[model samples]
Target chain A: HHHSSGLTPRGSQMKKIAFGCDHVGFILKHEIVAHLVERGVEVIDKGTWSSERTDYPHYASQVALAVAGGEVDGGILICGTGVGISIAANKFAGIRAVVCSEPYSAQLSRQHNDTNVLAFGSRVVGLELAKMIVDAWLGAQYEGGRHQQRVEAITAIEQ
Target chain B: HHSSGLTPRGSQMKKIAFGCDHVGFILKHEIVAHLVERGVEVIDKGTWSSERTDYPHYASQVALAVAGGEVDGGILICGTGVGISIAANKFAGIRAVVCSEPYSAQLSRQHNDTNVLAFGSRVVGLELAKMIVDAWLGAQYEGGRHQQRVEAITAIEQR
Candidate 1:
């Protein structure tokens, strides 16, 4: 089993990404997925195509589940403000989702909380910043030496 | 000069708080100033008025600064919503700000990551909620093991 820090202790390195977005983020999510594929990483797109009326929980459920199930190395969810959807994703048993406007917070969310899902608002944070958020989230690994107990307390509180 | 953390640890206790909206939250600021006068923990509210606009930084700044610093607490400014303001208050670093309408004073801010506690003149009577705010601001983060790890969080971020 995997730990809350999103680590397998001593497992092989993997690089598959899972992505999803609401109608507000459809185009942007598509762009990010394409960039991942072009860089030779396998990509999984969880949808909401032309439907603006779609629910935030739908995308959140899919991506958070994908990460917890180990179907993807990481996941990203995009919505109007990136706030509600990300909060919803964090409701999952093993998911620690953090929505970030900048790369620094995104990087730290991964490094500190070992967040499995990184989210942003297409309406609030621009596309470029979103890319930086994505890169930062994907690039960092959990700093788990002294931090492991903290991540455990976080998950334990959810119960 | 003091080390960071609670007292008895060679650290100066942090007296943090600030609030200012367009024209400013007058009564709200008055409450903070009153607290400062008796040497009751000082929180700096930028102004004192109740006029409304798209002012978010008044609330945002206090939350960010205290959460980033070793401050024991925080405060915020706004007319009311007590809903949307509380909603935005839940953002990563801004969780501590409790709403005057919610009646959730000390618990969330001290135990939860709520750094900024908010009250609005247009909604709840200013004087009544200020007592709640004072209590929240004085309440300490229930540190123990959590304190050590909160430090580890900053370490991972700066890394």
Candidate 2:
């Protein structure tokens, strides 16, 4: 049931997104949520909400489930290193979560794998770079064709 | 179990599962040749040609080989490294980490017990990729408190 959902039709730039983060990414996540909203996307904040101690997996699961269940077109997760949260998100059967530090990887993740979840480290990249990464990931469309088969094959490995 | 000779201290006989996308074909070939020259056995799952292949197919093959114990670990390459590694991480029991730097590559193996190393041909040159590969191969899992964390990571994969 994993459809390619590639190439967003024009004007659907207001795509729904599930966003979450742990304490380590709290400030950056706050900034990202505001930016996404400003960019006209419908945002659901699955929170740590504050700069308090919290487990990354809990937030990762919240966003992963929303994306997997089709409640959101995509999800964004944040943590200190991006590793723990990404590993947690990828546990979901239909989720292809990537932790990228650069815009090039973020864009390619969307174009090639149709990654449903994007994760990054607050400690690794600054606000401007994060915004660029998000814009690239959000704006890019999946190329499909052979890439579609590859995405299907990726999901099949979950079984 | 604590003996230093257990795995023969980075013995060249180590079997590696290797795969790559079309964009990564040249780099993979170069890396594979070097691995072979170093006496490491590489189980290459194909993207055999440069004719625009999907990365996930190769990524999954390498992941499955690692998960099924067909190979000791995996090495995946793609245009950006994010897609293939994201695909590989979908398989339960597989811990795949994409690293453009040697330090993180070494740490992923030591602290996280990552079973696969991923990198981008576009992001790293042959010299740097080989260094990252060496750092990854040279490190051993430090299973003290790290074991507890890795167990928690594995638990996330289970329902």
Candidate 3:
């Protein structure tokens, strides 16, 4: 049976995340990966796929593909500062990757911008906070009515 | 050597953009551009740089260009129904550009999302007494303490 009782509320759905990391975000990234899967949300890990050193952009692009292709509803790409990975992920069409050091940005990014990818800084945001941010991100829904037209306009760029 | 003596206050130097179709906005576009340029501030024309075509991409790109680069600070464009130009104005990253029929275009761009480009269609609306709708959206400003951090962005230019 569905733990969110099938309705999933705004954030109660088991949030599946496609996750990735480089050496810098290794530990914290793994922590988030395990935590979400443990809570009944599914996860797919694109590698460093191990803790080896690699460029953050590689991981970002990999995760972006997962979200953009709908293989996953959302993704997480982590690095030392969080900014680089998010910026890289955003370069891909239809992936709105945003870094949230706070819950407000986490909620707003999903709610207003329909951001599908999240990134955190392993050394900067810390593990406990990363969990909160990831939770906040997965739990939010896009506020589509008034914001829908705006989102459509933003999407018009590819055409 | 500088030709214009009218100076912008402090860090208040920012460009404003304007666009219009042949029917009504032609005069308003030219008038505002001249007024803004006289203040020693930058102003960009989104065209019909002449009183000619009915192109929306021309105006849309003007605003998109400002958002894409620091070339200009704000933009405004319009045509018949205020609809064609406003609809075209919905290009990606345009924050918000609307029409005015009550002679009030004054608005705060708020945190540099590039606000204040107001125009109205000639026939469906009155150019002399147009009021603004002001559905402009904006993002947070990252100035002050973040100044040094932002300046580091220039270093990437060398790459």
Give the best candidate by TM-score: 2
What TM-score does prediction 3 earn? Answer: 0.51
**Residue by residue across B1-159, what tens digits does model 2's lDDT show?**
665332323532289999998888879778998788667899989888888877878888898889999788999988888888878888889888886766666666776788888888998889888877877777888888767667876887887
Q: Candidate 1 or 2, higher TM-score? A: 2
Q: Where does model 3 sit among the CAPRI classes? A: incorrect
Ranking by DockQ: 2, 3, 1
What DockQ values do the models have?
0.04, 0.45, 0.05
Best candidate, DockQ-wise?
Answer: 2
TM for chain B in all models?
A: 0.61, 0.91, 0.49
- Model 2 residue A60 lDDT score: 85
Candidate 1 similarity to native, TM-score? 0.50
| Retained true contacts (fraction), each candidate | 0.00, 0.53, 0.03
Highest lDDT scorer: 2
Instruction: List the candidates ranked by TM-score, beginning with the highest.
Output: 2, 3, 1
lDDT of 1 by residue, A1-159 (tens): 545643222221238867878776675776777766765568788887775656566677788789889989877788765654665565566777766455656565566567777777776676766766677677777888755755665554343
